[PDB]
Amino acid sequence: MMIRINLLPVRAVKKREMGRQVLVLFAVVLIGAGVANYLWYDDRQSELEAHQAGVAS
Amino acid sequence: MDKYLDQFVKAPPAIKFGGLAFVVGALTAANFFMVIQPTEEEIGWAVAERRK
Amino acid sequence: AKGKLVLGLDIGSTSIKMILLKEQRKRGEVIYALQSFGMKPLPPEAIVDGALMNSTAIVQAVQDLMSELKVKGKDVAIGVSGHSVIIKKIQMPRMSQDELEESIQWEAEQYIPFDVKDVNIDTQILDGGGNDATGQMDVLLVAAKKDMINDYTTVVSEAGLAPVVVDVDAFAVQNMFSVNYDVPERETVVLINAGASVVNINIISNGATVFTRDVTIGGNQFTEEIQKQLNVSYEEAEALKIGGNGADADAVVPQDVERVLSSVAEQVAGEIQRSLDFYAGTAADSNFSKVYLSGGTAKIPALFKTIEARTGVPVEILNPFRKIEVDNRKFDPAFVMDVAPMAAVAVGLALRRPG
Amino acid sequence: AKGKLVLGLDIGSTSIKMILLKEQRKRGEVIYALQSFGMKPLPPEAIVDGALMNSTAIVQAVQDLMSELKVKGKDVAIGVSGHSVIIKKIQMPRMSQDELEESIQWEAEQYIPFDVKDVNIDTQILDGGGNDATGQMDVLLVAAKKDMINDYTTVVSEAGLAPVVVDVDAFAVQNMFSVNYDVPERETVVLINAGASVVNINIISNGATVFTRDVTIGGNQFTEEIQKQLNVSYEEAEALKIGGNGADADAVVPQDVERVLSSVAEQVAGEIQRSLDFYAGTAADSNFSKVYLSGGTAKIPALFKTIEARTGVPVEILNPFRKIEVDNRKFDPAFVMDVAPMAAVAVGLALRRPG
Secondary structure: OOOOOOOOOHHHHHHHHHHHHHHHHHHHHHHHHHHHHHHHHHHHHHHHHHHHHHHHO | OHHHHHHHHHOHHHHHHHHHHHHHHHHHHHHHHHHHHHHHHHHHHHHHHHHO | OOOOOOEEOOOOOOEEEEEEEEEEEEOOEEEEEEEEEEEEEOOOOOEEOOEEOOHHHHHHHHHHHHHHHOOOOOEEEEEEOHHHEEEEEEEEOOOOHHHHHHHHHHHHHHHOOOOOOOEEEEEEOOOHHHOOOOOOEEEEEEEEOHHHHHHHHHHHHHOOOEEEEEEEHHHHOOOOOHHHHHOOOOOEEEEEEEOOOOEEEEEEEOOEEEEEEEEOOOHHHHHHHHHHHOOOOHHHHHHHHHHHHHOOOHHHHHHHOHHHHHHHHHHHHHHHHHHHHHHOOOOOOOOOOEEEEEOHHHHOOOHHHHHHHHHOOOEEEOOHHHHOEOOOOOOOHHHHHHOHHHHOOOOHHHHHOOO | OOOOOOEEOOOOOOEEEEEEEEEEEEOOEEEEEEEEEEEEEOOOOOEEOOEEOOHHHHHHHHHHHHHHHOOOOOEEEEEEOHHHEEEEEEEEOOOOHHHHHHHHHHHHHHHOOOOOOOEEEEEEOOOHHHOOOOOOEEEEEEEEOHHHHHHHHHHHHHOOOEEEEEEEHHHHOOOOOHHHHHOOOOOEEEEEEEOOOOEEEEEEEOOEEEEEEEEOOOHHHHHHHHHHHOOOOHHHHHHHHHHHHHOOOHHHHHHHOHHHHHHHHHHHHHHHHHHHHHHOOOOOOOOOOEEEEEOHHHHOOOHHHHHHHHHOOOEEEOOHHHHOEOOOOOOOHHHHHHOHHHHOOOOHHHHHOOO
C-alpha cells in the first residue's frame, strides 16, 4: 500500500533557507559598514585632540 | 480573506526581515554621513584656528 | 504529539464529507471505531479546475462539517484533487535518501508541465530493503502546484484545523479495503472510484498498487447530459439522475434518461476498456480477476452490471465501513452501507489519521 | 434597575406587533401573564432589505402600538431582521472571556462580507462549565451591520422607548415553547417560522439549538405570485391569499389560486427538503421526530398537511400563549389562538423582557 503526503516540504524549505541567507548577508555587510563608521570616528577624535592642542597654542 | 493570509504565513518572515534590513542599511548610511560631516567641519575649525 | 486527527472529503466537488474514527472502548477492549461523519454538498464556485478559488467560503463549509460532527478534534488529514495531482511511476537507482529525493526531483522535472513551483512526494512500489544500492529502484511520484496545496492549507488554517497529511484520493480510497486485499496476495484487483470530477482506476496485486490512471469523465458528465437534453438546471438534472434512474416507479424514465446518458455510458466504457488495454502488457495471455467500485457516480442504477459485462471483470460495490467498528446504537448498518461508496475516501485518509 | 420592559415585532415587515406580559396577581399568587398586545400592518417603504430606511415614520407606528396597548412601560426588547443578521456556528478553544471574545471576532472576520463595521455576539451551544480551558469551545455568532442596529435604536429612541436587548427572531420565537421542548430532552424537534420576509428553520435537541438556517422564500412570494397572475395590487392579492384560500365558500378559488401558488409551494418544499438534508449528517440512519410552525405564512390553508407529507415530519401549529397566564375576562382563548403564529416572536422577546 502507498502512503503519500504532499504536506509542504521542498519549495517553502528552499525559500526559508534563501530567506535566511539573504539576511545573514545583510548582517555581515552592516557589521562591516559599522566597523568603518567606527574607525572613522577614532581618526576624527584624534584630529579633534590635535586641533584643541593647537587652539591652546 | 485567507489566501492572502497564508501567503502571509508562508512568506513575510522573509519580507519583514528584508524590510528591517533595508531600514538598518538606510540608518547606517545616515550615521556614516553624520560622521563624515563633522570631519569637514573639524578641518574647517582647524583652518580657522591656525589662521589665529 | 500522537493525535487522532480528522478526515474530510475536501475534493468531493459534489460533496464535502468528514469522518471521525477513534479508539472506542467496549468491555475493556479498544479498537478503531466510527465516532462521527458528516456530509454537505459543495457550494458552486468554491472549486474550479481542482483549485480552491474561494478558500474562506470552503472554510465556512468545513466548519459546518465539524460542528455538525460535534467533534473536539482540530487536526486533519485531507486530499488533493485528482485534477490537481500528477501521479506516475518512476525508475531510478537505490541509494541514500537525499540522493534519491534529488534524483527523483530531477527525473520528475520533464514530466511536470510547470516550473517547480511543484510539491513532490514519492513512495516505492516495492520494499527498498529488498534490493541493494544502485539496483531496483522504483518510486512513484505525486506532484502538485503550490497554488493548489496553498489553497488547501488556506481552507484548513481557517477552519481552525491543522493538517498533518495531504494524501491522494486514488490510494486513500484503498485503505478501507487494504486488509481484504492483503487476504489474496497474488490476485490482481481493480478499484474504480467514479467521482463527480474524475474517475480513478488503480489496479493492484494484493494491496500493492501496480498502477493508477485518472479519467476526466465522471458523474458530472451524466448530470450535464441530462441537463442538456431537457434544459434543466444542474441540481434538478442531478436529482433526475439519482431518483430518476433508480426508483421502483421509474419504468417510463429510463427511456427518456437512458437515451440522454447513453453516449456517456458508451464513452465511459470505451475509456475504461482503453485504460485496461494500456495496462495489459506483460501477461499477454491472461484474463482479469475481480474489482470494486467507490464514489457516488458508481451508484448509477445497473452501472455495475454494465461495467461487469462490458469490461470482462466482476465489478462489485464494497462496504468500506467493515474496516472499522460500528456501534449499532449510534449508526444502523443499512444507510452506512448506502453512503459507503461516497464515503470510502472520507474514511480513507481517516484510517490514515490514527495511524 | 430591574424592569419589565416591552416587546415589539419590529421586523415583521407585514406587521408591527407588540406584547406586554407581567407579574399578574390573583388570590395572593403572582405569575407572568398577558397584559396587552397590539398589531398594526407595516407601512411599506419603512423597511427595505432588512434596514430601517426611515426610523421616524416607523416611530410613529410604534407609538401607535404603545397607546393602543395603553401601556405605561417605555423599555423594550426587540429583534433584528433575519435578512440583517448572519447567524452561524463557530468552533474555538475555551479560555478567559476576553480571549474568547477577541478570538471570536477574529474567526468571524472572514465569514462577514463587510468590514467590522459589524456588531457581534455569541452564545455557547453547550455549557462552558462542562469543559476545561483549551478544549470543547463552541459559540454561535450573531453578526450585524451598525447601520441596521443604528436604524433600530433610532426608531426606538424616538418612540420614547429604551432598548435593553436586541435579540434574533429564530431563537426569540422559541422562548414560548422552551419549557415544552425541555420536557423531551433527547428528542430532535424542528421549528419553522414562516414570515413575510424570510422563513427560519431552527432544529434542536430539547431546547438546545443544534442549528438555524434562513430561507429568502416567504409569504411575500405567495402574495407576489397571486399579484403577478391577476395583475392585482399587493394588498388585494394578500387578502385573496388569506380569505381566498381558507373560506368555506372557497371551492372555486383553489384552482385559480392554487395554480398561481403551486410553483411557490414546490420551491418552498424543495428548499426545506434541501435544508433538512444539509443538516442530516451524523445520524446517517435515523428519521425525524416532530416539529412546529410559527409565523403568519404558516397559516396558508392546508400548508401544514403538505409540509407534513412532503418533509416526512409531523409539522404542527402550536399555541405560544400557553407559557403565560391569560385572564379569560380580558382575552378569549379562541382568537389568542388564532393570532398565536404571528405573535410567537412578539411574546418571545417578551418573556425575554421580565427575565
